[PDB]
């Protein structure tokens, strides 16, 4: 059973140079991510090794989803969990304008235009958490079944809250490929920042080899 009310509760429970600031905020949010995951139904019942696999595979996309949705009332910028706003022009002059703009146009602006709500966000993140394609999983079919339950609950919530928007459910799922590509590009940048070492311990562990 996968009630959207519990998923909402999970989101509400965790509510709080530019590359340095982004990194500090990300490290801090990794601790919060663990607390969020434990509130998603059935996750803590998975074998410890699997919980580890799922969080190491999904962490960067889960973090991107949160700061994008947090930033929807923000013009041309991003609200970090630390309370700091990072604007376009600031990211452009640090040499990271391209990736910043992708987040803004592909995620933030589209979340704003449709008024994606916090239950919808939480469900998308729970779907990303329960990724059955994660390597090493002791039972991928158990994770797939939990994924199926989240998106069945999501589809029923959209059809009830927004009955006049029949395409909304698909519209939500169709931000996930953008999220995946932006997550991959962010990882490349983080490995470069690690290399040109001018990064705190939890973020560092997430960038370690398995």
């Amino acid at each position: 059973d996968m009630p959207v009310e519990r998923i909402l509760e999970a989101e509400l429970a965790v509510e709080p140079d530019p590359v340095t600031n982004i990194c500090q905020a990300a490290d801090k949010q990794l601790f919060t991510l663990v607390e969020w995951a434990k509130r998603i139904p059935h996750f803590s019942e998975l074998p410890l090794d699997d919980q580890v696999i799922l969080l190491r595979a999904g962490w960067n996309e889960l973090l991107i989803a949160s700061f994008s949705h947090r930033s929807i009332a923000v013009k041309d910028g991003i609200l970090l969990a630390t309370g700091l706003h990072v604007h376009r022009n600031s990211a452009h002059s640090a040499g990271v304008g391209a990736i910043f703009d992708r987040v803004l146009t592909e995620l933030v602006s589209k979340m704003r235009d449709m008024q994606m709500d916090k239950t919808e966000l939480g469900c998308l993140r729970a779907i990303v958490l329960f990724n059955p394609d994660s390597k090493g999983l002791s039972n991928p079919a158990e994770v797939e079944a939990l994924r199926e339950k989240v998106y069945a609950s999501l589809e029923a919530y959209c059809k009830h809250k927004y009955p006049e928007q029949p395409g909304r459910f698909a519209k939500l799922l169709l931000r996930l490929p953008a999220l995946r590509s932006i997550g991959l590009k962010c990882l490349e940048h983080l490995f470069f920042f690690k290399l040109i070492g001018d990064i705190d311990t939890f973020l560092m562990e997430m960038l370690e080899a398995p």
Partner: peptide
């Protein structure tokens, strides 16, 4: 992966 482990345990 000690930090993630310790946090998942309690």
């Amino acid at each position: 992966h000690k930090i993630l482990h310790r946090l998942l345990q309690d």
